[PDB]
Amino acid sequence: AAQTNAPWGLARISSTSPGTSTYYYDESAGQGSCVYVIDTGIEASHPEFEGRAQMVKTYYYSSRDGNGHGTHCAGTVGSRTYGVVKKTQLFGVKVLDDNGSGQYSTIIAGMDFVASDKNNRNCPKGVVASLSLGGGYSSSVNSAAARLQSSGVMVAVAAGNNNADARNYSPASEPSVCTVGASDRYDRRSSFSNYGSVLDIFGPGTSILSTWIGGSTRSISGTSMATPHVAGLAAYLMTLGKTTAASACRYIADTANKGDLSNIPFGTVNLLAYNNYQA
């Protein structure tokens, strides 16, 4: 399949050259897998989610996304139009309040939660969890991510947006998960992107059009928007049976576009998420 005038991150993830406008992906499109968007919520009514999203648990009073971030992320991982995987099933776990903040324990909790809860769902193709969130290094936060990840989920993790070394940021630095950096459309590391020896790969994170609350849409920029592209790239390939939750990251990394990105520091990998879709 092709999506003409696709968003550029979408066209990029499926091009071996910056510049293109179509997103080419296999049609299975993520279906079979599940993606927990552990974030602020997910306007599960967005017509763009066609009914494939649903709040599974909040850690607050509502379950609504009153922010946008998550619908945005949910969006990129698998909204019809704005998304990598147009057929994934999305579950919202709301760990971040409507300003987009969260305590490390309710996110630890959200992580132990999807580890359990996934057990009572039908996610035949793999289960991914996408954490476009983060903070200062914490070994319990890393522990949570690593538990979640060893419990069998494919944790994609934002490198962070502090254009620093992701080592002092947490999930980002749980070397066992999949820290994701951002690139812009000219193939440069996104100016805000964290980097370092712990990043495993890059995805489109600058100026990313996606779903927004109100049944709307909106571009924003972040390692927060690249994560969902690997989250969804991951999911899309799990359902493609190309890798598993336990190795989706190494595989996404080995098969990526290399040497392409400009702006990469010695120490950081020059690898850009890529689906090798051959029609």
């Binding site: 922010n67 946008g68 971030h69 945005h72 971040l96 409507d98 300003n99 987009g100 903040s101 969260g102 476009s132 969130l133 983060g134 903070g135 200062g136 934002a158 490198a159 962070g160 947006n161 940021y169 805000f192 924003i220 920029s221 972040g222 390692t223 927060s224 928007m225």
Partner: peptide, 8 residues
Amino acid sequence: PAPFAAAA
């Protein structure tokens, strides 16, 4: 520390 980011 949290959004890693957007405006909302």
